[PDB]
RNA sequence: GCGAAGGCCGGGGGCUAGAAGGCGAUCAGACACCACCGUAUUCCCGGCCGUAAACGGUGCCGCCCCGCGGCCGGCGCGCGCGUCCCGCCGGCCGCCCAGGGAAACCGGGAGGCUCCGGGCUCUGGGGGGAGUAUGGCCGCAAGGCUGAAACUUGAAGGCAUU
């Protein structure tokens, strides 16, 4: 299921890109 | 004919028609002519021109089938030419195939 | 020539009066030679478009054939649009002209506006579709001409349609389908019942 | 494109059905979309069927059938030979063959 | 319609009809059996006798009306029929391509044409549509009148029933045309068409 | 056991229609010796003769016990033609009750 | 719901004549529906028709001749100036020459002919040719 | 007062006219393959032969199609005298 | 306001199956498929979440339209009288005449439409980048919802034939 497998992919870089945002301000 | 039909630089339909009517008014069932070689191009095509009924294989092939071959010269290079010619009627002998029956 | 149909018999003694008689009746044209007998004049003006080369694949490889389209019509009131495939290029246009002669249908034609004399327009608004293609033939002005694509264009002087307004719907750049358009909407020219015809 | 009008099951006026396990496979396959074919056969093999008859010392003793509902999914009957991929024209016949 | 062809279409069961019926055939339907036969009054079926006849004698050449049937029963009629009125007769299969192909080895150019059932001969109606050609078929309560221009009502299914109605007709051209007086009844028995 | 070619059947089904009565039915030599004349039938070759003539001797047989389809016997159309021109006497065929008083013909009523 | 009832009756009229239907029925009935068919009378493109009275709507039994080619309605209907009324006549009617577009006015209601010759103009209730 | 689009001069131009179904009036195309042209004879009072003389009946593709043919022919040949209103 | 499943938060409850985890095989490897054990979960109550190939991939209300059958509910008509028959109305369906469509197919419409106009809402505008970024709102979270541009590329896609 690439496609599923994508938007599970994306959403846990997402979920690091927050952290790190998290991190700053 | 066709050898000089085509170093008259007369169209490969034109000249290969020209001799299938021929044959067919002298009444052979089949003619076929195969012209092969560079047809105006750098790439060899094969193209076979053939009208009524021509038989392929089996003995009657070596009795009823006239096959001939030619190596017409063309500028580009070598354009060799079979003409095939099937008369079933040649006098001396049958199709062993056809049956003749009767009334 | 020996007649093949019985229509071609009652056209090899002359019986018939016109291409228009037979269309009165709707019959099938079958056999080539009864449009060249109403044709003595050098025939009709014919002319081939769209020569296509078509390949079928096979375990050996392609097979090239080539379907042409050619369209057959007086200056004044037929047109006919035939097709035929074959591996030479010649046999194929031998085989559309014939499917052209045998598909010939007549245009009713008529007046923009004025109504001086000879029929200048189309009688209507006509519309033919093939595939995607829609056409719409719409009268116009004896000043204007046959506003329209090249190859409608030529149908429409191959139809003795002197002005006409066009507009093409679809993918217009498939000529077969574009012909084929132009050609049934012109097979409707007799199809619609108008108050002239009311009686 | 759509292969089948039904879509491959018998839902009508419906939005969800029953579930049914493949007996073979055990997975899980809509009650519309399921084999379902009803067997009734003997309790014994039809080889062994008289024999059992004559032992059995009950007079007028009728042998057991056997009543059971097998159900399966596609790919779980497709490959038993159950149902058989058919032509575009054979797949419209719903009649049961024989 | 005369009280001898009703006594004879009574025996004939050219009332009895199929327990389908179509909208269109509900005109000739008389009623319907408690089984579910649906009978037709045989004045409606007569009436289309006799007006089919007159399209019938309009043709010049009444060697130019094809009669095809494929039905078994229906063979020795359309025959007898053919030699009592001289028509194109197509027993059996009918064969593609009759009527459109030219070079057909039994092609035939009809101005009319008569079909024993619409579905048994679907094919020769088909064709007829191409060729401009009428036709005129015998119907059964479920009448698919789809390209048949005049339809007569009968079982058309009991060999006896199409023996009569092929009978009833070729009697009724020949009277119109001339030969027999519808005075003096036809020396032919209508048991000579039906096959046994 | 060896399938007769299209050739040798056509063939035989037209041999055996045109000589049906000189044709003899479980004989292979005797129907060889017809199929050889070169006048009711000309075959070229030995081996087509043979295999025309055994074809032709099937077919015989298969004439006179149940005739079968292609062959055009004379012997059985003119009794075909007897039965389908034959006229059965007085014909029964000449000799709902609501319809029929409707059209108000009221045949055999009471 | 049914917003317009004269669309309604031009689509079964139209539906009729392509079954071949000779006379059809129309549910409800409105002047302005009988204005329009009245001109379809006057220009021979329908035959007899007859409001039957229900005690509501009304309902229309429509006699048709085949003459009539497309009949429909312009929703909404746009108030056509009289320099507008010949543009109209180039898309919507086939030929100059042949078709009617029907037009309430506050003269009447009228074919485009009838309003090019009072030189008035007004909204576009439908269209027959 | 003619069946044909006129000119000016008000003489008959294009060409022929189509026939039209007796039943829909509707004009027959040229190409319409399915239209029939059948006719039906009329009797005399004594010996009720025909008479040479037949009422012609042009039926249109479409209307054979939908079947109503058979419908219309008997409406069409009551009016036309030669069937029995009934 | 409601909303499958999974998830989450409190209480419980805990038979089965079983995301994780652990094992035994397999294989070149195998932390996969298959066997085995088993936690969350599955179940209930009070909430959150707000999503599914949530599909008829077909919004809603209205009109007409062609036959032929099946089933379901209600009702009426004959008839001995039967869970008959023929209707009617509402529903669910199958085939399909036209007609439509690029075709598959739809035909209780995807018909009545280049001959184009019944009313209303929503969505799309080559394929990526990208449902990304950022801002907002919402949720406890997971995430939901709204939603770019720079930049890249000449096709991507549908249906059908071989």
């Not at chain 5, 009895?16 to 036969?37: A, E, H, P």
Request: glycine letters at 6%; aromatic letters at 6%.
């Amino acid at each position: 299921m690439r496609a599923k497998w994508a938007k599970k992919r994306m959403r846990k870089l997402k979920r690091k890109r927050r952290h790190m945002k998290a991190r700053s301000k | 004919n066709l050898r000089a039909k085509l170093e008259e630089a007369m169209p490969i339909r034109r000249a290969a028609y020209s001799i299938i009517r021929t044959a067919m008014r002298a009444g052979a069932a089949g003619c076929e002519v195969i012209v092969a070689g560079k047809l105006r191009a750098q790439r060899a095509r094969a193209n076979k021109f053939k009208e009524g009924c021509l038989i392929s294989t089996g003995h009657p092939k070596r009795i009823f089938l006239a096959e001939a071959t030619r190596h017409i010269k063309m500028r580009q290079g070598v354009i060799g030419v079979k003409v095939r010619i099937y008369n079933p009627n040649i006098r001396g002998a049958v199709m062993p195939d056809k049956i003749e029956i009767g009334a | 020539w020996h007649p093949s149909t019985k229509l071609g018999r009652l056209v090899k003694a002359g019986k018939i009066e016109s291409l228009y008689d037979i269309f009165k009746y709707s019959l099938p044209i079958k056999e080539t030679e009864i449009i060249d007998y109403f044709f003595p004049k050098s025939e009709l003006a014919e002319e081939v478009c769209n020569i296509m080369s078509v390949q079928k694949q096979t375990t050996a490889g392609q097979r090239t054939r080539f379907r042409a389209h050619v369209i057959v019509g007086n200056r004044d009131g037929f047109i006919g649009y035939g097709a035929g495939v074959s591996k030479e290029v010649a046999n194929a246009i031998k085989k559309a002209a014939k499917n052209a002669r045998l598909n010939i249908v007549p245009v009713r034609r008529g007046f923009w506006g004025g109504k001086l004399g000879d029929p200048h327009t189309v009688s209507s608004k006509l519309s033919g579709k093939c595939g995607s293609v829609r056409v719409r033939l719409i009268p116009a002005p004896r000043g204007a001409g046959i506003v329209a694509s090249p190859t409608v264009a030529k149908v429409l002087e191959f139809a003795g349609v002197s002005d006409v307004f066009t507009r093409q719907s679809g993918h217009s750049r498939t000529l077969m389908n574009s012909v084929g358009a132009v050609y049934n909407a012109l097979k409707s020219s007799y199809s619609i019942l108008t108050p002239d015809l009311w009686k | 494109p759509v292969k089948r009008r039904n879509n491959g099951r018998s839902k009508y006026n419906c939005g969800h059905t029953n579930i049914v396990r493949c007996q073979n496979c055990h997975r899980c396959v809509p009650k519309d979309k399921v084999i379902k074919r009803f067997t009734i056969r003997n309790i014994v093999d039809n080889t062994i069927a008289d024999d059992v008859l004559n032992a059995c010392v009950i007079q007028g003793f009728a042998i057991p059938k056997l009543y059971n509902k097998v159900q399966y999914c596609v790919s779980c009957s497709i490959h038993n030979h159950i149902v058989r991929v058919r032509s575009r024209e054979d797949r419209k016949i719903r009649t049961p063959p024989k | 319609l005369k009280e001898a062809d009703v006594k004879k279409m009574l025996v004939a069961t050219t009332h009895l009809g199929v327990r389908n019926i179509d909208r269109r055939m509900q005109f000739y339907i008389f009623d319907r059996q408690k089984d579910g036969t649906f009978v037709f009054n045989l004045q409606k079926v007569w009436a289309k006798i006799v007006f089919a006849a007159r399209i019938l004698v309009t043709i010049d050449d009444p060697a130019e009306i094809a009669v095809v049937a494929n039905r078994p029963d229906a063979q020795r009629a359309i025959l007898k029929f053919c030699k009592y009125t001289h028509a194109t007769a197509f027993p059996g299969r009918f064969i593609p391509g009759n009527f459109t192909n030219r070079m057909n080895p039994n092609y035939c150019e009809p101005r009319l044409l008569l079909v024993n059932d619409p579905v048994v001969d679907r094919q020769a109606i088909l064709e007829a549509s191409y060729v401009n050609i009428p036709t005129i078929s015998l119907c059964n309560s479920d009448a698919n009148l789809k390209f048949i221009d005049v339809a007569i009502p009968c079982n058309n299914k009991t060999p006896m029933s199409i023996g009569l109605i092929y009978w009833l007709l070729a009697r009724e051209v020949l009277r119109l045309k001339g030969s027999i007086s519808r005075t003096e009844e036809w020396d032919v028995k209508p048991d000579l068409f039906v096959a046994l | 056991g060896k399938v007769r070619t299209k050739t040798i059947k056509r063939a035989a089904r037209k041999i055996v229609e045109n000589n049906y009565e000189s044709l003899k039915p479980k004989d292979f030599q005797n129907n060889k010796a017809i199929c050889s004349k070169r006048n009711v039938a000309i075959i070229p070759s030995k081996r087509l003769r043979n295999k025309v003539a055994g074809y032709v001797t099937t077919l015989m047989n298969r004439v006179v016990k149940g005739p079968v389809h292609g062959i055009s016997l004379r012997l059985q159309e003119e009794e075909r033609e007897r039965r389908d021109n034959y006229a059965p006497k007085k014909s029964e065929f000449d000799v709902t009750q609501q319809m029929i008083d409707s059209i108000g013909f009221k045949c055999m009523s009471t | 719901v049914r917003i317009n009832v004269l669309r309604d009756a031009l689509k079964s009229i139209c539906n009729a004549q392509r079954i071949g239907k000779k006379q059809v029925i129309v549910r409800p009935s409105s002047k302005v529906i009988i204005e329009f068919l009245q001109l379809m009378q006057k220009n021979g493109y329908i035959s007899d028709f007859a409001v039957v009275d229900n005690h509501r709507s009304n309902r229309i039994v429509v006699n048709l001749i085949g003459r009539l080619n497309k009949a429909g309605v312009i929703s909404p209907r746009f108030d056509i100036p009289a320099n507008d009324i010949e543009k109209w006549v180039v898309n919507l009617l086939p030929s100059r020459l042949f078709g009617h577009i029907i037009l309430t006015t506050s003269q009447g209601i009228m074919d485009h002919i009838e309003a090019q010759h009072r030189q008035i103009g007004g909204k576009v209730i439908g269209y027959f040719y | 007062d003619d069946i044909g689009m006129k000119n000016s001069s008000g003489v008959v131009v294009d060409a022929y006219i189509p026939r039209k179904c007796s039943a829909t009036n509707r004009l027959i195309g040229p190409k319409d393959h399915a239209a029939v042209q059948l006719s039906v004879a009329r009797v005399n009072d004594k010996g009720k032969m025909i008479e040479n003389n037949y009422v012609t009946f042009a039926f249109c593709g479409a209307i054979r199609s939908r079947g109503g043919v058979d419908s219309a022919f008997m409406l069409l040949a009551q009016e036309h005298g030669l069937m029995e209103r009934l």
